[PDB]
Scaffold this active site. Structure first.
Site, PDB file in Angstrom:
ATOM      1  N   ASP A   1       0.842  -1.196   0.000  1.00 21.42           N
ATOM      2  CA  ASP A   1       0.000   0.000   0.000  1.00 21.42           C
ATOM      3  C   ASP A   1       0.877   1.247   0.000  1.00 21.42           C
ATOM      4  OD1 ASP A   1      -2.739  -0.780  -0.025  1.00 21.42           O
ATOM      5  OD2 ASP A   1      -2.569  -1.450   2.045  1.00 21.42           O
TER       6      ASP A   1
ATOM      7  N   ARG B   1       1.414   3.805   1.831  1.00 20.13           N
ATOM      8  CA  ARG B   1       0.686   5.057   1.986  1.00 20.13           C
ATOM      9  C   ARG B   1       1.635   6.250   2.090  1.00 20.13           C
ATOM     10  NH1 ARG B   1      -3.396   5.339  -0.265  1.00 20.13           N
ATOM     11  NH2 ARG B   1      -4.207   6.969   1.131  1.00 20.13           N
TER      12      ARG B   1
ATOM     13  N   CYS C   1      -4.871  -0.506   6.877  1.00 19.09           N
ATOM     14  CA  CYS C   1      -4.326  -1.356   5.817  1.00 19.09           C
ATOM     15  C   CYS C   1      -5.414  -2.178   5.112  1.00 19.09           C
ATOM     16  CB  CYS C   1      -3.274  -2.302   6.412  1.00 19.09           C
ATOM     17  SG  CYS C   1      -2.584  -3.474   5.235  1.00 19.09           S
TER      18      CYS C   1
HETATM   19 ZN   LIG Z   1      -1.328  -2.140   3.704  1.00 18.33          ZN
END
Ligand SMILES: [Zn+2]
Ligand SMILES: [Zn+2]
Ligand SMILES: [Zn+2]
Ligand SMILES: [Zn+2]
Lengths: 214, 213, 213, 214
Positions: free
Chosen positions: B42, B44, B99
């Site tokens: 991910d 972020r 997540c």
């Molecule tokens: Zn994640």
């Protein structure tokens, strides 16, 4: 730096944005799915975000030693499947880099241990293109292999059941094979760009030929 | 789109070469990373920006939900190479609240192939069912995110790669962190281990203290 | 030694061709296996001999300690091929008491690479620590062998391969067995599942009943 | 047969040996380490024990779709490492068989699903030897690929860090590449037998050439 240093840098870094530009965390707070999947090397010489000038969260990322897409590596295959079938990324970029320690270890082949197994997938490429690499100046072979590798991975990715299915369903997904050097951080397109099961095979054969004739 | 990326890269490169013609020379000066960062795909917030580290200072691995599966050669190869060849002094497994991988594991939607990978997280959810049970259904996902990092740290320390590195006296420290998107502030889950014994002790207290906070 | 093997094979072949010139024709008659057998590499007693099945009636997979790791593509590929392509009606995970892999996991000797694979069994040992604890230290390994098969059956049923096969209405039954070398007698661990719901129910009672016997 | 049938056959089978030849279970009861590691296909057309006339427990076994030894498959690599470093087997046999469904699925390449990923490792071989296979009668190609596959796996096994280490330590281990057909169950030696890092490379190059010239 030491651990306490990273934690301090984060504490200070965060304290600023939270008062200076609170908007930064507001944008992240938005459930905006990434449109690109970046498959790069663990070396991460230059962060993908910085190389492409993309904001945080706009890139779904996977990194392994020498940016490989092994037919049967469920780690990468799972990242790919989630990106393609769940996030529905539009583009997948496999990015290698000249000077990669992995690629170099694959050739020099020292006794590094466990990692040499993973690297044998790169040695298969080294051999596969022994004619093209042999018909070249020695100090140019590693950089060439580095490109061949990225090209082979793109090919592997296109042949995975995940991509074949996505393309059969008519889903719009494009895979790219890129590379760059730490002397200028300039991205070079190895033009093996595939958008379906057809362009994949041709662009591959063509991508290889180019190097073989030029 | 794609074209934009190549353009941003072109300009970015030019701009840096002009402002700091040494920036790239700095990178050229082959510098082995001292840290290994195991995070989620991910991504972020980039690790470099969270830690204030410059490019090349971090060897990195990312997979869905930052897992360290006992038998995943992908992650294990990155770890063995970083530990035995690069000789990193620190390994950081970092998760993040919210997540998607962690949430997908609990909600259990039919997502396809990825669900097999996520079964490792479901194992953790069920393993700590009592602890999570006696807790507001709202704070459960965030706690699972923490438990997951703690369990992956535990797995990493039990790998033959770490067990043999510590046995030969090599100095390697493994850490378990997590951050939220609302402040990007890193939280040390306090499961830091420097050897086999502390790995066990930190895991035990790590889980136990959660059952207190 | 090797030479002996080629000789035994030569004679065996000749002998069969002469006694039953049809034996090999029988095999030639392409017959899809109806069973998938997942056992241990130790293969103390061949599956064919234990079940009284003739060659080709069993599609087979063997690894150390007959595991079905959530993310092991080797075993998962054998399962997907057997289920979606061969359309086996039954899948049997069979363990055996005295298994070296199971013992190695508990004793935890430094054996090298294999210890990573065995960590999946250690997870089970610790997962059922209370049940095993309140039990003679002597009967613990055998119980762990049973628990392991039961856990692998559970994993197999949770795989996307089995979940989607059952969802589309395909008839597949998974079983968990174990046998001892002192009689080669198969014991049904009774965790037989035909769908998602019974898989859960059988696992629950399977573990619960052990805590009674 | 159905499940209750197998359980019945076992019950009866066991009841006999336990009264008839109790010595059978006495021999097994002996902690005698296996001296051979058999890496074969899940098809298991003819059980390894029956093919070699070996008693139960004399063979450590691993089976996967099309008897592969993927550079990075930790399932097979773990079986190999335990056999070599812990059991100390003297011989490792990779045995393929003509008519193998896996090999055939790799070529025909139907859309079988998940399994096609694992099979791409066989398609890499199909392509790698496209000149040798193309210079052959069509109805002979699958059987040839079947041999090429076994030969490539033996090679892969020899290159694994597990074998390189064993051979470097001076441990005596020999790897063989065999194959057989269900028409006679007769084992054919593809002579790619390796006993060290040297004979491995030569026997490989020679094994391939033979087919390429004969
Ligand atoms: Zn994640
Ligand atoms: Zn690299
Ligand atoms: Zn066993
Ligand atoms: Zn086969």
């Amino acid at each position: 730096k030491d651990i306490d240093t990273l934690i301090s840098n984060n504490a200070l870094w965060s304290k600023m944005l939270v008062e200076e530009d609170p908007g930064f965390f507001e944008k992240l707070a938005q459930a905006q799915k990434p449109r690109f999947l970046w498959i790069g090397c663990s070396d991460s010489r230059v962060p993908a975000e910085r190389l492409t000038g993309l904001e945080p969260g706009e890139l779904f990322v996977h990194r392994n030693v020498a940016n490989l897409v092994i037919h049967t590596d469920l780690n990468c295959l799972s990242v790919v499947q989630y990106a393609v079938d769940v996030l529905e990324v539009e583009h997948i970029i496999i990015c290698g880099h000249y000077g990669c320690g992995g690629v170099q270890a694959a050739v020099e082949n020292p006794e590094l241990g466990l990692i040499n197994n993973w690297l044998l997938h790169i040695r298969d490429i080294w051999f596969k293109h022994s004619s093209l690499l042999g018909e070249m100046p020695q100090e140019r072979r590693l950089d060439t292999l580095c490109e061949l590798n990225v090209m082979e991975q793109v090919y592997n990715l296109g042949h995975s059941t995940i991509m074949q299915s996505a393309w059969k369903r008519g889903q719009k997904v494009t895979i790219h094979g890129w590379a760059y050097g730490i002397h200028d951080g300039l991205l070079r397109d190895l033009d093996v760009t595939a958008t379906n099961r057809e362009t994949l095979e041709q662009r591959y054969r063509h991508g290889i030929s180019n190097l073989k004739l030029k």
